[PDB]
C-alpha cells in the first residue's frame, strides 16, 4: 500500500505518492482542483491505500478537497493542524494558531533532520522565511511575495507592462539593467529576491551565529541558491514535516 | 504666474504648484482624478497660469485628465513624450518609446543635476531602480513592486493576511524575526526592499564605479536611507526631469 501527499496552497496544490517510507513514485502541480483530479486519475492504478495532507486553503475549501480525494482512493485523509510544539520544536507565534501551516512543518522539518540552528527559506508563489534557535525554538519569521506574485500583478494590474512568457525567460539570461520591459521587470524582482535572501542570512547570522545550517525550498530555489553554497535545497522540505505531523503506519 | 505640475502614476497622481523657477508652494498626493479636483479646489486658489505633466497612464485617461485641468485653469497643459535623447541624456532602451516616462524624466534629470555616473531608485508605489553612465548613456533599469504593490498582493493572494495600518505601523519597529502576521509581512516586505537596495548599490559599483552619484525618490526613500548615508535624497526628482521635457515661458 502507498501513500497520497498533498501540500495544498492558494494557487497550486502539490502531490505525490510514496512508496514505503518516503521513495516518490509520481507527482505533480495542479493550478486548479479539476487538474487535480485529472492528473490523480491517469496514475488512479496505483494501490494508494493512505493519505495526509497540510493545506493553507479555506477549511471549507480544504475539507471539499478531502471529501473529492476519499472518491478516488479508498483513504481516509489526514490533515495537518496547528500546534505550540512538534517533533521537539515549540511555536515561536503568539497566537499559534496563526502560523501558516506550511511554514510550520517546513521548519519543524529542518530542525528535526538538522537538530541545530537553522534558517528555513521557502521561495515559492510567495516567500516565507523563518528561524529556529539550536534548542528547538522557532523564533518567528517573514512574508513577502514570490517571483508568479510580482510578475502577475506587475504583467496584468499595471497599465504599460507587457510581455510573453518566452520574453520572460530568456529575461533571467542577465541581472544587469534591463533595456526591454520583461528585462527590468524579470530582473528587477529576481535581484529583490535574491537581496531578501542575502538579508535573511544576515539576519540569521546575527541571531543564531554564523553556523546555523540553512534549508532552501519551493519552485524557484534555484534561482537563489549560488547565494548559499552550502544551504541544503529540499524540494519535498514541508512533506517530511507533513510525516512527523501525520505519522502513518 | 505659476505652474501646476502632476506626476500620474498607476496608482496616484502626485502634484504641486510652483512659484518661479521652481519653488513649490503647494501640493499633494491624490487616489483619483476625483480626489485630485477636490484638493486642487479646496486650497485658497493660486494664480496657475501654466501647467505641464508626465503620466504613465493610457492616452486616454491622460487626456481625459487634461480635459479637466484646462477647464479648471486657463492652460493649455503640456504633456511630457518619449524621446531617444533629452538634456544631453541618451534612453537605454531597446524600444524608446516603451521606457516609462516617469523613469525617463527622473534618470534625466538625475544626470543632468550630477554630469556624472549616477544609480537613481524611485520607492514608490512601485520601485524603479535606473543607472546612467557618466557620459549620460543610459544602462537601463529595473521595475519591482513597492511596498504597497507587494501588501496588495499578498492580500490578494490569501485572506489570511488582514490587519490594521495601526499593526502595520508598529510592526516595522523592528526588523526581527515576525510572531505575528503582521510583523512577518510587514518586516518581510520592507527586508526586501532594502535588499533590493543594497542588490542596486553593487551593481552600480560594479558597472558605474564606487563613486557614483546615488539618487533617491519616492515616499518610501525613506525606509532605505539609512543604507546609503551619502545618497541624494529628493523628493520631486521627476519634476526637475518635467521642466526639462516641457519648459514653459
Ligand atoms: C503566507 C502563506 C500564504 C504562504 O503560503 C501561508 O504561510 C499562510 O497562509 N500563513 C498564515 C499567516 C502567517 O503565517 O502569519
Ligand atoms: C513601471 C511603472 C509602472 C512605474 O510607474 C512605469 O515606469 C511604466 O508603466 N513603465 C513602462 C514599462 C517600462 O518602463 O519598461
Redesign the pocket.
Known amino acids: 500500500s502507498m501513500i497520497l501527499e498533498l501540500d495544498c496552497?492558494?494557487s497550486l496544490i502539490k502531490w505525490r505518492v510514496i512508496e514505503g517510507a518516503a521513495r516518490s513514485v509520481a507527482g505533480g502541480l495542479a493550478e486548479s482542483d479539476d487538474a487535480l483530479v485529472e492528473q490523480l486519475t491517469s496514475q488512479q492504478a496505483l494501490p494508494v491505500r493512505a493519505c495526509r495532507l497540510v493545506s493553507?486553503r479555506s477549511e471549507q475549501e480544504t475539507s471539499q478537497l478531502v471529501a473529492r480525494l476519499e472518491q478516488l482512493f479508498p483513504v481516509s485523509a489526514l490533515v495537518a493542524s496547528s500546534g505550540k510544539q512538534l517533533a521537539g520544536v515549540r511555536n515561536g507565534?503568539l497566537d499559534y494558531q496563526?502560523?501558516?501551516?506550511?511554514?510550520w512543518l517546513a521548519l519543524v522539518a529542518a530542525h528535526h533532520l538538522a537538530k541545530k540552528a537553522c534558517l528555513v527559506i521557502?521561495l515559492?508563489?510567495?516567500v516565507?522565511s523563518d528561524l529556529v534557535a539550536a534548542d528547538g525554538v522557532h523564533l518567528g519569521?517573514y512574508?513577502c511575495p514570490g517571483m508568479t506574485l510580482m510578475r502577475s500583478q506587475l504583467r496584468t494590474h499595471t497599465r504599460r507592462i507587457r510581455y510573453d512568457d518566452a520574453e520572460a525567460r530568456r529575461a533571467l539570461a542577465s541581472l544587469q539593467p534591463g533595456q526591454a520591459t520583461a528585462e527590468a521587470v524579470e530582473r528587477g524582482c529576481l535581484l529583490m529576491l535574491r537581496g531578501f535572501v542575502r538579508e535573511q542570512y544576515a539576519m540569521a547570522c546575527e541571531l543564531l551565529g554564523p553556523d546555523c545550517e540553512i534549508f532552501l525550498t519551493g519552485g524557484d530555489a534555484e534561482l537563489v541558491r549560488d547565494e548559499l553554497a552550502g544551504a541544503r535545497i529540499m524540494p519535498d522540505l514541508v512533506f517530511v514535516g507533513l510525516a512527523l505531523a501525520c505519522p502513518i503506519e
Chains 1, 2 share one sequence.
Do not use: E, S
Not at 98 to 103: A, E
Open positions: 496552497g492558494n493553507v507565534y496563526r502560523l501558516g501551516l506550511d511554514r521557502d515559492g508563489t510567495a516565507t519569521g512574508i
